[PDB]
Amino acid sequence: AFCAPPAYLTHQQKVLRLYKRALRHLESWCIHRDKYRYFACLMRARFEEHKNEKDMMRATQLLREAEEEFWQNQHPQPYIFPDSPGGTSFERYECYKVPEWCLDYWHPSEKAMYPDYFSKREQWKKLRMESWDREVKQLQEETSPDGIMTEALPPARREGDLPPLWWHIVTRPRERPT
Amino acid sequence: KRLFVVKPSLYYDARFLRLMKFYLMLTGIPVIIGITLVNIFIGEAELAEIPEGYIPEHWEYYKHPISRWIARNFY
Amino acid sequence: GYTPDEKLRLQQLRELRRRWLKDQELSPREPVLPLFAVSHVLIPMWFVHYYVKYHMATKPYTIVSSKPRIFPGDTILETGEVIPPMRDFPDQHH
Amino acid sequence: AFFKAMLFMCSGSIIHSLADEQDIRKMGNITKIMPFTSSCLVIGSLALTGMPFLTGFYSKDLIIEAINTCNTNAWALLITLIATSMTAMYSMRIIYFVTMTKPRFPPLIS
Amino acid sequence: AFHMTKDMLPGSYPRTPEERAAAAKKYNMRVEDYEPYPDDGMGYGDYPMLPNRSQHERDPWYQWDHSELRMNWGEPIHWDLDMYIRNRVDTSPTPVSWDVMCKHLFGFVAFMVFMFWVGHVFPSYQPVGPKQYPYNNLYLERGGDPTKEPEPVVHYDI
Amino acid sequence: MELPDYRQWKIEGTPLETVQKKLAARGLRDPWARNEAWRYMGGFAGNITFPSVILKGFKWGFAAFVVALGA
Amino acid sequence: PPLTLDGIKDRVLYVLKLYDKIDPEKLSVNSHFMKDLGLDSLDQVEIIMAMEDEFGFEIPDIDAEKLMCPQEIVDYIADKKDVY
Amino acid sequence: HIQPRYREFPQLTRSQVIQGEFLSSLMWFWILWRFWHDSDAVLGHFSYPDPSQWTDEELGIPPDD
Amino acid sequence: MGAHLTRRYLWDASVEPDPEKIPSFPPDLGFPERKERVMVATQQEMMDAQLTLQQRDYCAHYLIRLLKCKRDSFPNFLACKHEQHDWDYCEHLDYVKRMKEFERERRLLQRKKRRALKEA
Amino acid sequence: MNIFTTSILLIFILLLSPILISMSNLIKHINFPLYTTTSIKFSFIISLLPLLMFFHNNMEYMITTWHWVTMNSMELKMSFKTDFFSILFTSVALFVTWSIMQFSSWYMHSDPNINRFIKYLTLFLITMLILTSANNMFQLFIGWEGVGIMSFLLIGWWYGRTDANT
Amino acid sequence: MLKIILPSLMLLPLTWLSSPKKTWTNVTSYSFLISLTSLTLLWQTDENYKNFSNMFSSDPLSTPLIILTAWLLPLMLMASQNHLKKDNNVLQKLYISMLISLQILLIMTFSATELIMFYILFEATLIPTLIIITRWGNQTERLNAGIYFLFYTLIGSIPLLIALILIQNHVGTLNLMILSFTTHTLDASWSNNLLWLACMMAFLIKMPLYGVHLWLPKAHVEAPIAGSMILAAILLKLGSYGMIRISIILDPLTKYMAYPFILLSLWGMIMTSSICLRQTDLKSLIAYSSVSHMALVIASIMIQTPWSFMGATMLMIAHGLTSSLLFCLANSNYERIHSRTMIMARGLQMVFPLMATWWLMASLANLALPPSINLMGELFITMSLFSWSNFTIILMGINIIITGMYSMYMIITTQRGKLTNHMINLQPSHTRELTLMALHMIPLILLTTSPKLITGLT
Ligand SMILES: CCCCCCCCCCCCCCCCCC(=O)OC[C@H](COP(=O)(O)OCCN)OC(=O)CCCCCCCCCCCCCCCCC
């Protein structure tokens, strides 16, 4: 979720991302562990061979027939973890992730308690406004010299400057609000 | 490590009820005291026969006393 | 792999997230605030009874039952009659 | 109502005790790690499978033999009985995978 | 209409090729990907005909600006995004081919329905004669007329 | 929280070992087998048999029955 | 208990010390899997997967094509579950 | 409160084991007690008649002709 | 689910009787004299014991007994056990009564078929 | 035997008592999970009293508590039947409910809104029992639709998750 | 009934004469009491309806409404204190007076004995409404919406004018009392078959029928909240009240001249209900919900069975209150969001906890949850429709399933799901917003306790 999506996918990342779906869809078929760990080091073998094929055409012909072998030999109910897509606990504790710009409309009574909390909050909001200028300028001075732009954003590159467009990767509602 | 739990401001959705649950309860209880004490001490009437020429007034045909107070005084 | 710069952005922004979560921590004092069983079983009960024995009971067809399933040879309290017994079937053979 | 309520809260116990794992595939050997729920689970499982002299047995076999004795669809009569064997099967599936197997839960145990 | 010029809002079917490339700018698309909905005069206009794929299979990990619509800010919205939202229709590849699904499901349904029919034809009934109720099949108690006696229905031993 | 010495875990003595030996027959080394060892390593090492679960507590249950039957 | 970093740190270190290819007496945080521990890219898929099964969550593909220092794994895991 | 354990068999409290064996043992005492006192799980207690041993006199099968 | 179904559906037919219309031959197809069944309980006894219409069988009389001993003996629901055996038995004795009637109708229909070939 | 009628009316009043406590400001001061668990416990005992009665002699009581509309020929009234189906089920349901609320307190511990969750569970029980003991079918409808809506509110407890909403 | 009316007129002097700062409270506080005087009409201890005087009468059908018409003026003036609080102090006093005249006129129309008094007052209500929609309407299209609202009603209105003058010549007085106790039986000619259409069509237009309902979606979209409340709660029901009092005459023809409308309405109920299912503008969806739930009413005021009419009276008062509640909360989202789009603003319960409870109860009123007058109403129209033809349940059965779906979808995509990331931060709820709602639902709870009062004439 953190890093940005690459435009096109390489050959490798397509092969190496099957090694994951495949092995992980082999642990739904092999419910036990010793059977699995066995039937899987046999999987690597399949990927281990045909590793050094230099003939791209061939390589993309082993890959295209691997992902069809896989599609027809996949488990309907695989083991997808909780907190991962589709499976449970994915958006469970999102009802309790309020977006933090809401503590700004609190009644002076409510914010009266919880006093030091807002003393540190006002510091961070000073940090945010104190750098928007140096940030956006950075974002721009370092802008692409071509139309080729990826969603990757730059680091800080100077002391005191806060690595940019950061207010929402930091200050993110905590995962488990509980 | 108690942690601060951000929450929507909850005074505006609570100041409301202390005011709605209050000004209903303001005029509500004196009513409830009124319906109960009347219904207790004064009581609904018991039905009877028109006594040969009483020609009962409009209020006389209703059971509950305050329900025939309004009738006698206003209708 | 990690682009050199990408690992300085995640380097730095993680450093800030760690401070935000520290700041989220509440200071001591942070929250500055400025048998009964019979109670809700008996008190509710008296009322109900008041209602069931002096409104329902009083009004017509508000609490209706079935019969008492009288059996042969058992007496009827209200009238005094004694239900006639059955015949003497001697089948046995259980 | 009694036994199904038990099995679901039994799994409530397993799911909450484990790190919210709701899949039989990663849950194993609860019988030794948590005998209290496993004992409750098998009591419930046998009641679901109509073990003799348990709450399911008093009502369930009355229904079964009712079928075996009434005039009924032949297809309905055959499916209801194998449905009863299937109830034992999936009941077996739960205890074997959830309780009697080497543990496959995540490594830290709490 | 805060900041929206007619030319920043949709328009008519792009007739000439320069117009098809002008619209593609409006909609923040690539000029070779703007494929106007077919011109049959049902109103679509210049709205792009985006792939009919539901938000369900939009990468579920990427930080979509609008998280729940799994749609970014600016990307052309689909005409029927009121139907392909995650809470509604799905078009997400299925391990079993769709035809195979439709045939199998309905086959099952039919075989069952049929077998149930084979059943009604050939029922299962124990070797037991009919149950015998006393009096005249409880004529009076089944609520029968007290005055009119029924043709006696008698049941004999063995 | 202290953690058990990584060394403690070993594949012999567990079902992973037999998987290890047949994999070795093919020439594969079964690299992550050691990680999957604590599953079978100890405490959870004993095989669990289906009668054992169904019959848990039967021993005292019958002991209780006999006594009650006596009285 | 909640996951303290110095623990998560040890846990990721530990599992690797159980992978046969990775020397148990050298794996040192900051020892890049591939250019130091000299592990195949195919391996790193697995090393990550072990971690996904030690800590019970999925390191997304794009964010996991880069978990190569044996430490990135220790802050990424921690940053994910919000461990300060 | 208990302590998290890593790759080890979670320690068990006295009560956890005793209550578990208690509920299961009562299940077995009840099954055994009822089986002894009321064994009508098998046979009920009424035997099926062999419908094919009823003398033709019993059913009113007239002497053919 | 007996073999009776096999005999009728599969293989032979017109012999195994039809479930419906089981009583189909004269009440006396060679039955010399048969006293009609006897009902112990008075139509009223039942109506006063509020027996469900269905439960008003020829065993209604042993039922009323059970129900008697179940209202009496109230706190003890495990002591009206002899009464239940009796009712059940009465129910079996008629369960077999029904079994015997069905077998008799079977055999009689066979008589017809046997007599049929005497014909020609 | 008023003891019977009053008991059937009383279970509803006792279970409704947690609902209005949350309506007033009082629940903040006492513990809602413990209080609700106790009252269902007392409701089960109250349910037992009619159950024993029915066993003594089989009597069925139709209780017409309130009239709602004359509506000319079709009068509408609030009626609770106490036939074998209704009281047997009422006792079984509350026992299960008494079990679950105690389970709920352990299961949803750390949920920031435990009290609302317990509140809806009892509202579900009130609709479910109304569905059970309903003489006229209009009340049966109130129960039939009523459990449907609160199931909607409770299946999707965690509204954020779209899967729960779907 | 001149206390429900004269004191009302005097409101106008008070909105004008009063201080700019105190104008709002004098008007809202006083009309709350004006509603209290309105409650006196409910004291009917006898069947004989109340003929206050020659021109002014109140029978069971009008009384439940006159009280609602008086009740909403307070609420309308409380829902429009925000927008309309940016005005010049003479634009306000015009808006307040406009709202005041609507109920003065509407109170009289619902409380009028002479049918043409209904017509003059009936078609006058357009003047105040068109001003409220066109002058203060936010969108560029209100000029258009105003045109649609004036012409559809006006083209229907002149036929009724000719018809009522026609019956006055045929019978000799348009007095609803007499017309009822006199023999006016149409003769199924081709001409009468036109009279009937002339009288019903004007009423059928403002009661959106499937054929002519396009005016209502367009009008409520750009109309200010007070205008949308008035159109849904009182304005549309003017058409229903008219159909009940006008079909006393034209007694024989509707037996066979109704089929066209009945089928138009029941099929219309399904399609109007369904398009609610995918409409991006929330105010748009509530408006079509209003068309469908009003299509049921024209299908009960035409079957003409006692229960229908009773179902109609129940549903009209109930749906009036519910619709406003929905239009009022839609506005509260619109003012903070600044857009009518349903897709934006997701997750509000996370940030506006209570408004969501009001949203939930409003939706449950919208769909037929059973201990609500809304359900009693539909249950009754459903029954009679079934009596008309058992097949009707199929069409009145697809509507119930669809009505459940769109009512909950409004709750599911507006008040649940993950919060919108950062729309202009949504300021907390005012107490006015919440009361304006509470004032709508507390009466819905109280009326459901004793449905007899809104039970109709039948
Ligand atoms: C009038 C025409 C329409 C006008 C609309 C706008 C009017 C606004 C200004 C006026 C507001 C007040 C006047 C309208 C409310 C009238 C209330 C009322 O009439 O209560 C009557 C009731 C006595 O009951 P009664 O019907 O006389 O007895 C039946 C005997 N067979 O007396 C009582 O019992 C009072 C009880 C108070 C609290 C009752 C709460 C009960 C809630 C039950 C339902 C709960 C679930 C509802 C679900 C709804 C879902 C949307």
Chains B and I make contact, 3+ CB pairs within 8 Å:
no
Tell me the pairing of strands J76-81 and C63-64. unpaired
Q: How many CA atoms lie within 13 Å of E54's alpha carbon, on the beta-carbon side?
A: 13
Rounded Cα distance between K5 and K7, Å, is 6
Q: What angle do CA E133, E136, E137 make, to 5 degrees?
A: 35
Question: Which residue in J80, J84, J83 sits closest to J64, CA to CA?
Answer: J80
Main-chain dihedrals φ then ψ at residue C40, nearest 5 degrees: -95, 25
Atom of ligand 1 nearest to the CA of K369: 50
Rounded Cα distance between D55 and D75, Å, is 28
Burial of I113 (0-12, 13-18, 19+ CB in 10 A): exposed
- The alpha carbon of K295 is separated from its chain's Cα centroid by a whole number of angstroms, namely 13
Q: Tokens for I13?
A: 């037919």
Q: Tokens for D28?
A: 């194993």
Could you tell me the CA-to-CA distances from D63 to D88, E122, F9, H40 in Å, in that order?
16, 22, 53, 16
Q: Tokens for K349?
A: 């319960």
Q: Kindly report the protein residue whose alpha carbon is nearest to atom 6 of ligand 1.
A: K68
Ramachandran quadrant class, E70 (left: phi over 0; alpha: psi -120 to 50; beta: rest): left
Long-range contacts for K36-43 (Cβ within 8 Å, ≥24 apart)?
Answer: K37/K3, K37/K4, K37/K7, K38/K4, K38/K66, K38/K67, K38/K70, K38/K71, K38/K107, K39/K67, K40/B74, K40/K3, K41/K1, K41/K4, K41/K66, K41/K67, K42/K67, K42/K453, K43/B70, K43/B75
Q: Kindly report the protein residue whose alpha carbon is nearest to atom 51 of ligand 1.
A: K365
The dihedral sign for the CA sequence D59, D65, D69, D73:
positive
- The technique by which this structure was obtained is cryo-EM
Tell me the pairing of strands C63-64 and J62-69. antiparallel
As a whole number of Å, the CA-based R_g of chain C is 40
Rounded Cα distance between K157 and K205, Å, is 9
The residue annotated as part of the active site, out of G10, G40, G63, G79, is: G40
HEC per residue, chain K: CCCCCHHHHCHHHHHHHCCCCCHHHHHHHHHHHHHHHHHHHHCCCCCCCECCCCCCCECCCCHHHHHHHHHHHHHHHHHCCCCCCCCCCCCHHHHHHHHHHHHHHHHHHHCCCEHHHHHHHHHHCHHHHHHHHHHHCCCCCHHHHHHHHHHHHHHHHHHHHHHHHHHHHHCCCCEHHHHHCCCCCCCCCCCHHHHHHHHHHHHHHHCCCCCCCCHHHHHHHHCCHHHHHHHHHHHHHHHHHHHHHHCCCCCCCHHHHCHHHHHHHHHHHHHHHHHHHCCCEHHHHHHHHHHHHHHCHHHCCCCCCHHHHHHHHHHHHHHHHHHHHHHHHHHHHHHHHCCCECCCCCCHHHCCHHHHHHHHHHHHHHCCCCCCHHHHHHHHHHHHHHHHCCCHHHHHHHHHHHHHHHHHHHHHHHCCCCCCCCCCCCCCCCHHHHHHHHHHHHHHHHHHHCHHHHCCCC
Q: Tokens for K372?
A: 């609500």
Distance B63 CA to ligand 1 centre (A): 21
Residue pointed to by tokens 């409340």: K229
Question: Which residue in J122, J160, J114 sits closest to J38, CA to CA?
Answer: J122
Q: Do I28 and H56 make contact, defined as CB atoms within 8 angstroms?
A: no
Q: Tokens for G7?
A: 């623990």
Could you tell me the CA-to-CA distances from F21 to C5, E74, I87 in Å, in that order?
46, 58, 69
CB–CB of C16/A173 below 8 Å? no
Which are the contacts of A148, defined by CB distance < 8 A and separation ≥ 6? none
Q: Tokens for A80?
A: 């997808």
**Is any Cβ of chain J less than 8 angstroms from the Cβ of E80?**
no
Which are the contacts of K11, defined by CB distance < 8 A and separation ≥ 6? K27, K30, K31, K34, K73, K100, K104
HEC per residue, chain D: CHHHHHHHHHHHHHHHHCCCCCCHHHCCCHHHHCHHHHHHHHHHHHHHCCCCCCHHHHHHHHHHHHHHHCCECHHHHHHHHHHHHHHHHHHHHHHHHHHCCCCCCCCEEC
Q: Which chains touch F (3 or more CB pairs under 8 A)?
A: A, D, G, H
Query: Which residues of chain A neighbour G58 with C-beta distances below 8 Å?
Result: 80-81, 83-84
Main-chain dihedrals φ then ψ at residue K427, nearest 5 degrees: -60, 150
Query: Which residues of chain C neighbour A124 with C-beta distances below 8 Å?
Result: 20, 23
Q: What ranges do the domains of chain G cover? A: 1-84
Distance K445 CA to ligand 1 centre (A): 6
**Is any Cβ of chain I less than 8 angstroms from the Cβ of H63?**
yes
Question: Which residue in F66, F61, J100 sits closest to D42, CA to CA?
Answer: F61
Rounded Cα distance between G32 and G71, Å, is 9
Rounded Cα distance between A42 and I119, Å, is 80
CB–CB of E102/I26 below 8 Å? no
Resolution of the experimental model, in Å, one decimal: 3.3
Choose one of K69, K450, K453 to mutate for the ligand 1 pocket test, by most ligand atoms within 8 angstroms of C-beta: K450
Q: Tell me if residue G53 is catalytic.
A: no
The dihedral sign for the CA sequence K66, K67, K73, K79:
negative
The dihedral sign for the CA sequence I40, I46, I49, I53:
positive
The dihedral sign for the CA sequence K301, K306, K309, K311:
negative
- The alpha carbon of A141 is separated from its chain's Cα centroid by a whole number of angstroms, namely 28
Query: Which residues of chain H neighbour I104 with C-beta distances below 8 Å?
Result: 54, 58-61
Residue pointed to by tokens 């099949």: E137
Instruction: Please tell me what DSSP assigns to residue J67.
Output: E
Tell me the one-letter amino acid at A128.
R
Rounded Cα distance between K260 and K253, Å, is 12
Tell me the one-letter amino acid at J140.
L
CB–CB of K112/K118 below 8 Å? yes
Mutation to test the F interface, candidates G5, G15, G18, G23, most F Cβ within 10 Å: G18
Exposed e or buried b per residue across D19-53, where buried means at least 16 C-beta atoms within 10 angstroms of its C-beta: bebebbbbbbbbbbbbbbbbbbbbbbbbbbbbbeb
Q: Which chains touch J (3 or more CB pairs under 8 A)?
A: A, B, C, D, E, I, K
Q: Tokens for K312?
A: 């109609």
Rounded Cα distance between H33 and D53, Å, is 9
Q: Do A113 and C23 make contact, defined as CB atoms within 8 angstroms?
A: no
Which are the contacts of K195, defined by CB distance < 8 A and separation ≥ 6? K163, K166, K167, K186, K250, K253
CA closest to H56 among chain E residues: E158
Rounded Cα distance between K406 and K337, Å, is 21
Rounded Cα distance between A137 and A142, Å, is 8
Q: Do H58 and E127 make contact, defined as CB atoms within 8 angstroms?
A: no
Chains D and K make contact, 3+ CB pairs within 8 Å:
no
E66 three-state secondary structure: strand
Distance J69 CA to ligand 1 centre (A): 12
Q: What ranges do the domains of chain K cover? A: 2-458
Question: Which residue in G1, K348, K362 sits closest to J159, CA to CA?
Answer: K348
Q: Tokens for I3?
A: 């073999």
